[PDB]
């Protein structure tokens, strides 16, 4: 289909800093990708973001009842929903499964540390060779979202293994209380 | 530190709408517009929280009305198609004969309309596939996941085929053992 498309988007955003100590609410309106008007809880009124949003701001700012709804949002909406969902979202912890397998950059000179299934996203992966950290020659996929509330990442060490060498992939992650380490021997 | 977003959209002339909550970029739930039901992204979510799906339908009705208003305001300026970037990956390291999941990741595109087909040895597959709704991005494009559970063999090749009005021809992304 070649007919032109037109998209309206709205995003009501709750931003949380140190739990619910500092909360910021943004009521954001978009035409295609262009945000045209916004309510910011730091401001307490709608403000046009672009020319297209001026009529919106004036209209909604003339409605005192609407504005007072939005000014309480940090309490009645953001902090509220934070409390309802905190246990299965903020407190969700899924620890990583760690696999090490060899590979070849050219038809093994590549050690893959596959870190799978963890939540949340923040993770540190390090490579060791006979107890020494190996920082040169590391490439990674970066952080990958699986879309099912888990992450994965592959961290690859370029190296020429000599016999009698032990390589160690070490994984740190908030679900862990001490680093997770997997060895590979040549 | 943490961000919860209630994200809505409404698309003309397709008359497609969507309503969902997002936590740090993962979907908490969305509202099936046809069945008028809350669909939890993970089953366990629905046993600690509830959501009245009716109110979402009201928000989409306003979104539709506002889209009419903003369309006129823009002098009927339409969206510009942004084509997707597609990646195929596995859930976990691939072992022969041990079940796994192919993931087709469609990212950074708009409008939120896409045809996605899994092909095994060049033939469309249907059995056991699943997918997400359109997940919003911070640059206000979209992303989407498609899933195909499978048994890894040396016989089978797979491709994820993505069609989008921004592409001149379908995008195929390949995977094999």
């Amino acid at each position: 289909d070649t007919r032109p498309r037109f998209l309206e988007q709205v995003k009501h955003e709750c931003h949380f800093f140190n739990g619910t100590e500092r909360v910021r609410f943004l009521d954001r309106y978009f035409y295609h990708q262009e945000e045209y008007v916004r309510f910011d809880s730091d401001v307490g009124e709608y403000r046009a973001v672009t020319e297209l949003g001026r009529p919106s701001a004036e209209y909604w700012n003339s409605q005192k009842d609407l504005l007072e709804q939005r000014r309480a949002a940090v309490d009645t909406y953001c902090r509220h929903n934070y409390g309802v969902g905190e246990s299965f979202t903020v407190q969700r912890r899924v620890y990583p499964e760690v696999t090490v397998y060899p590979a070849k950059t050219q038809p093994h000179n590549l050690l893959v540390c596959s870190v799978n299934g963890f939540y949340p996203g923040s993770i540190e992966v390090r490579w060791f060779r006979n107890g020494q950290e190996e920082k040169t020659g590391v490439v990674s996929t970066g952080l990958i979202q699986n879309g099912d509330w888990t992450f994965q990442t592959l961290v690859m060490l370029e190296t020429v293994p000599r016999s009698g060498e032990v390589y160690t992939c070490q994984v740190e992650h908030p679900s862990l209380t001490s680093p997770l380490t997997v060895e590979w021997r040549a | 530190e943490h961000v919860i977003i209630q994200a809505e959209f409404y698309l003309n002339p397709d008359q497609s709408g969507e309503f969902m909550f997002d936590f740090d970029g993962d979907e908490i739930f969305h509202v099936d517009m046809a069945k008028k039901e809350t669909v939890w992204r993970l089953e366990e979510f629905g046993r600690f929280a509830s959501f009245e799906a009716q109110g979402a339908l009201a928000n989409i009705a306003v979104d539709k009305a506002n889209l009419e208003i903003m369309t006129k305001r823009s002098n009927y300026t339409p969206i510009t198609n942004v084509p997707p970037e597609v990646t195929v990956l596995t859930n976990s390291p691939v072992e022969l004969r041990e079940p796994n999941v192919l993931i087709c990741f469609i990212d950074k595109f708009t409008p939120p309309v896409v045809n996605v087909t899994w092909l095994r040895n060049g033939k469309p597959v249907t059995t056991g596939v699943s997918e997400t709704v359109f997940l919003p991005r911070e640059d206000h494009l979209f992303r989407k996941f498609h899933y195909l559970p499978f048994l890894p063999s040396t016989e089978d090749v797979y491709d994820c085929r993505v069609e989008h009005w921004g592409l001149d021809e379908p995008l195929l992304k390949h995977w094999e053992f």
Binding site: V10, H12, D27, P55, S56, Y59, W60, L66, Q69, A73, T76, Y77, H80, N81, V84, G85 | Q6, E8, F21, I28, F48, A49, S50, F51, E52, G55, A56, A58, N59, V62, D63, A65, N66, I69, M70, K72
Partner: peptide
């Protein structure tokens, strides 16, 4: 137990 929505505003012509 209940997640709250946040109402979308009808704009003006």
């Amino acid at each position: 137990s209940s997640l709250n929505l946040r109402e979308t505003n009808l704009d003006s012509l």
